[PDB]
């Protein structure tokens, strides 16, 4: 019926039951205590089973912190997972690891409908047998490094270089022409960036499609491991039962697996390399797994991903990375120049970039792109610099259409509308080739590079052209 | 040895720290007094900044510095010394009552003979004092003398409770020490009381590796660096701060006006002096280039317990920032930046005053104006 | 003039033999410290990893 | 105790100097060690020459050394430390053999052992 508390050792606890009646691994239990005289405090706190360890002992995780407790409280088990709530419910609030709003507006329905937090992963015979490319409406996203359904992409960067303002207009634009939702979770990151966002996104408006699940650094390693799990629970509901395609952001996959290490020497487990534990491939592969693309719907997902001192061989970043698609890659030197946004063209990788998944034109003019970029790269800096300039023909050309086309890149984002009068443009792909292609035959030669900044389609560059006295 | 301490109220020490709704986006400065952090890498109210570094650098210098150079605000002080000699708190406490500087700090200690768990429990004891102040309304400093000492305790400590081994012998949960203090310095909200805790933790590298345990936890925490480098320091740059790594994630909005209009400039000239010295025949403009670079790095550089006000400092920046030093020999620059001040110590008053009062730049043409007079009135060497 | 030329690249010819002469020995050295930190780093890792296994028992 | 203040100002702007040469001297090291002395700029060369100088010259010669060498050992005041090294940073004795400079007690010593070295 109910345990008592044995052993309090930091956040691992352990609990004793009667014969026959032990919870389910996975299971969790609740402690509700009064203090009863002065020498003693409340206590509101939540655990979640680990390990049988027999003699009706179990030995179990806390999601709080477990100073004030007593060797000989009483425990009950609920007799489920932990369950968040699913549905419209949940778009434009904040929620926690358990579920519960940190926001002021109120508290959800106890009759509503409650999803448990673990389940197994989509079998073989219901998975999309096809490659299916994502539409983004970027420009050099679209071109360069194309997006998949069901992939996973790995974003590189970090301050200065505006990665939230891709995060809100990947939002905006996918919510408004896929009709989807978003869903952030923060883990284990820092609490001022998660005030900021929060922020910025009511600013912008796009929070009436999103859900917020935040789990930071000032909380124990119980619920630094366990919030990603709750976000990817909000996402698969929409997926399963309105069947649309959603994108899933993640602030830190790293600390994910680093609270993982944190527990595993406190339930008695042999280190592995590198002072990991033992099973974590087997726990990556458990959470990556979930997010694909099924019959009804998919769900994308956005990651960001921390390098320890910036060594990849670290075995937390090479598990992680054997499950990404593509990478992106922000770059301050682009932003200082003024290119929004501010995506390196010639350090971003995809998997899709392949003439029988995007098709032989795409592909060409990708290539044709990419090889004139590192022409530029190559020439710019050895030569014409440290006194060395020179004006060989087909050399001016080449650095001219290198200009024209690097300032094409550039984006007007719908959500950077509030500090400009530009309403900003959604791009599909075929455009954005056909201008590529255009500026490459040299059409467009005729032109100033101003006219090539923050545009759509390539059509409205001449109109910019046409009242710039050209 | 001055008598009991009467006081009436206790707080835990170990407390969780505000939620994401409970706070606001840092926007107030905090001043420090030295030219190279208020210009390259400002600090604002809220804010966790590291000072990382090694031995022979004078952290404690800057963090003295920047406790005196409070005096004219209202902000209280705390230092929390792990691990160090008593007669260095002495002398530094010496200092800090020389300068008056005892009306609104507060000191606590845990020198090296004391045993490991009060080096432990030091921290947490010194936030804890600080936020009595934050909860009600006021601003509060607070300097961990250093946190690879407090780190060192900790390990002594789970090693004698025969708690398992992790990498360098530390225990497992190293990080969430760290994460969990740092995480309890805040800008509350205007419903909270919009009172704010600042933090400045000390790291100390051996050999100046920072790619090493500790200095990576902690480096992940802060919100920017301030890195002090040794090569730096034999060559003349005696604040030694490597403008290169060193940086800052709110800096921008904890600024005023006029230090922003001005601060941007300086970055990029100083990057691009120190981005193409590396291969110094050569190009007409790269002389000079490189002339303005020697510039700056002979305009950064400032002595000891010299805290110069915010004013004076966008001055002499903007001084520098149009090129109207480049009539005047290296050598002499710091004389320049000796002379200026005094200048307007009678002369341009009403500017200064315009600087204070409005935190914007005053009419241009005549800031140039005067600097011309200057400089009729300026020898050449 | 044309003797001075014929001298020029005799010169630079001869200064950039000993030049590669000199980086090759800077390597070998180099890769003399490189081995010795390898396997201090293999000696370390294994002694972290059974010291923290035998903490168990 | 290496302050302004504690020491004095000479002594200080001295000591300052004679690191920021060393240091320098350091950074040219693996430069001149692969490709050489002759590709390097004429106040390269002349930090250069006053570095070895001043490295040679930071040596002494010790009472309780006698019994492995012979010399008899050596006591310098600071004022004598001082002056000499300001002498050295000022190019006064930049004509001397870099080996004068070698396990001596003062300046004068180096002046006398130079030249009966033939210079
Ligand atoms: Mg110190």
Redesign the interface.
């Known amino acids: 019926t109910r345990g008592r508390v044995i052993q309090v050792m930091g956040p691992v606890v352990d609990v004793k039951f009667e014969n026959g009646h032990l919870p389910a691994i996975y299971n969790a239990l609740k402690i509700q205590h009064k203090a009863r005289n002065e020498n003693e405090v409340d206590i509101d706190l939540t655990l979640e089973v680990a390990l049988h360890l027999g003699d009706d002992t179990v030995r179990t995780i806390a999601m709080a912190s477990t100073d004030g407790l007593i060797r000989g409280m009483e425990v009950i088990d609920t007799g489920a997972p932990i369950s968040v709530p699913v549905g419209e419910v949940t778009l434009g609030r904040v929620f926690n690891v358990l579920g519960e709003p940190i926001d002021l507006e109120g508290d959800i329905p106890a009759d509503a409908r409650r999803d448990p937090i673990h389940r197994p992963a989509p079998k073989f015979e219901e998975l999309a047998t096809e490659v299916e490319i994502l539409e983004t409406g970027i420009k050099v996203v679209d071109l360069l490094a194309p997006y998949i359904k069901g992939g996973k992409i790995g974003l590189f960067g970090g301050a200065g270089v505006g990665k939230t303002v891709l995060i809100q207009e990947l939002i905006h634009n996918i919510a408004q022409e896929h009709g989807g939702i978003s869903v952030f979770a923060g883990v284990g990151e820092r609490t001022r960036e998660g005030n900021d966002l929060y922020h910025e996104m009511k600013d912008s408006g796009v929070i009436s499609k999103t859900a917020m699940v935040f789990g930071q650094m000032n909380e124990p390693p119980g619920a630094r491991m366990r919030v990603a799990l709750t976000g990817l629970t909000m996402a698969e509901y929409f997926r399963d039962e309105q069947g649309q395609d959603v994108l899933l952001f993640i602030d830190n996959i790293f600390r994910f697996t680093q609270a993982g290490s944190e527990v595993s020497?406190l339930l008695?487990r042999?280190?592995?390399?590198?002072?990991y534990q033992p099973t974590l491939a087997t726990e990556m592969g458990q959470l990556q797994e979930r997010i694909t693309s099924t019959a009804k719907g998919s769900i994308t997902s956005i990651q960001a991903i921390y390098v320890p001192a910036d060594d990849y061989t670290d075995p937390a970043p090479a598990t992680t990375f054997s499950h990404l698609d593509a990478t992106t890659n922000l770059e301050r030197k682009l932003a200082e120049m003024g290119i929004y946004p501010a995506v390196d063209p010639l350090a971003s990788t995809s998997r899709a970039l392949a003439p029988e998944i995007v098709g032989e034109e795409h592909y060409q003019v990708a290539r044709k792109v990419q090889q004139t970029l590192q022409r530029y790269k190559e020439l710019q800096d050895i030569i014409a610099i440290l006194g060395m300039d020179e004006l060989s023909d087909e050399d001016k050309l080449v650095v001219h259409r290198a200009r024209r086309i690097q300032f094409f890149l550039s984006q007007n984002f719908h959500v950077a509308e509030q500090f400009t009068g530009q309403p900003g443009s959604y791009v599909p792909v075929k455009e954005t080739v056909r201008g590529f292609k255009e500026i490459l035959e040299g059409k467009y030669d005729h032109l100033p590079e101003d006219a090539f900044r923050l545009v759509g389609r390539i059509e409205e560059v001449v109109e910019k052209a046409k009242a710039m006295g050209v | 040895g001055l008598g009991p301490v009467e006081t009436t109220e206790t707080r835990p020490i170990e407390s969780p720290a505000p939620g994401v709704m409970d706070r606001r986006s840092v926007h107030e400065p905090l001043q420090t007094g030295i030219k190279a952090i208020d210009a390259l890498v400002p600090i604002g109210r809220g804010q966790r900044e590291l000072i990382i570094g090694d031995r022979q650098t004078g952290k404690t210098s800057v963090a003295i510095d920047t406790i005196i150079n409070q005096k004219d605000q209202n902000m209280i002080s705390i230092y929390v010394a792990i691990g160090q000699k008593e007669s260095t708190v002495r002398t530094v406490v010496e200092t800090l009552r020389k300068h008056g500087a005892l009306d609104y700090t507060i000191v606590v200690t845990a020198s090296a003979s004391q045993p490991a768990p009060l080096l432990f429990l030091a921290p947490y004891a010194g936030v804890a004092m600080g936020e009595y102040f934050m909860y009600k309304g006021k601003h509060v400093l607070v300097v961990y003398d250093d946190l690879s000492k407090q780190a060192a305790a900790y390990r002594e400590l789970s090693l004698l409770l025969?708690?398992?081994?992790?990498?360098?012998?530390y225990p497992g949960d190293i990080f969430y020490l760290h994460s969990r203090l740092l995480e309890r310095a805040a800008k509350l909200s205007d419903a909270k009381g919009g009172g704010s805790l600042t933090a400045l933790p000390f790291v100390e590298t051996q050999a100046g590796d920072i790619s090493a345990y500790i200095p990576t936890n902690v480096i992940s925490i802060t919100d920017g660096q301030i890195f002090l480098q040794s090569d730096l320091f034999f060559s003349g740059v005696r604040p030694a701060i490597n403008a290169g790594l060193s940086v800052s994630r709110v800096g921008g909005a904890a600024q005023i006006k006029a230090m922003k209009k001005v601060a941007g400039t300086l970055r990029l000239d100083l990057a691009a002096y120190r981005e193409l010295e590396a291969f110094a025949d050569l190009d007409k403009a790269t002389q000079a280039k490189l002339a303005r670079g020697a510039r700056t790095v002979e305009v950064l550089k400032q002595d000891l317990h010299q805290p110069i006000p915010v004013e004076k400092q966008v001055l002499i920046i903007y001084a520098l920032t149009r090129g109207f030093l480049d009539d005047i020999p290296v050598e002499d620059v710091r004389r320049f930046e000796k002379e200026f001040y005094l200048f307007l110590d009678q002369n341009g008053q009403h500017l200064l005053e315009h600087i204070r009062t409005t935190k914007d730049l005053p009419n241009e043409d005549d800031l140039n104006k005067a600097i011309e007079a200057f400089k009729k009135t300026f020898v050449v060497s | 003039l044309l003797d001075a030329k014929a001298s020029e690249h005799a010169a630079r010819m001869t200064?950039m033999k000993?030049?590669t002469d000199?980086?090759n020995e800077?390597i070998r050295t180099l890769t003399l410290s490189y081995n010795r930190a390898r396997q201090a780093a293999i000696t370390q890792?294994i002694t972290?990893?059974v010291?923290?296994?035998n903490?168990?028992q």
């Not at chain 1, 042999?270 to 002072?275: N, R």
Request: charged share 20%; net charge neutral.
């Open positions: 020497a008695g042999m280190p592995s390399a590198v002072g | 025969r708690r398992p081994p992790g990498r360098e012998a | 200064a000993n030049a000199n980086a800077l890792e972290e990893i010291a923290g296994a903490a168990l």
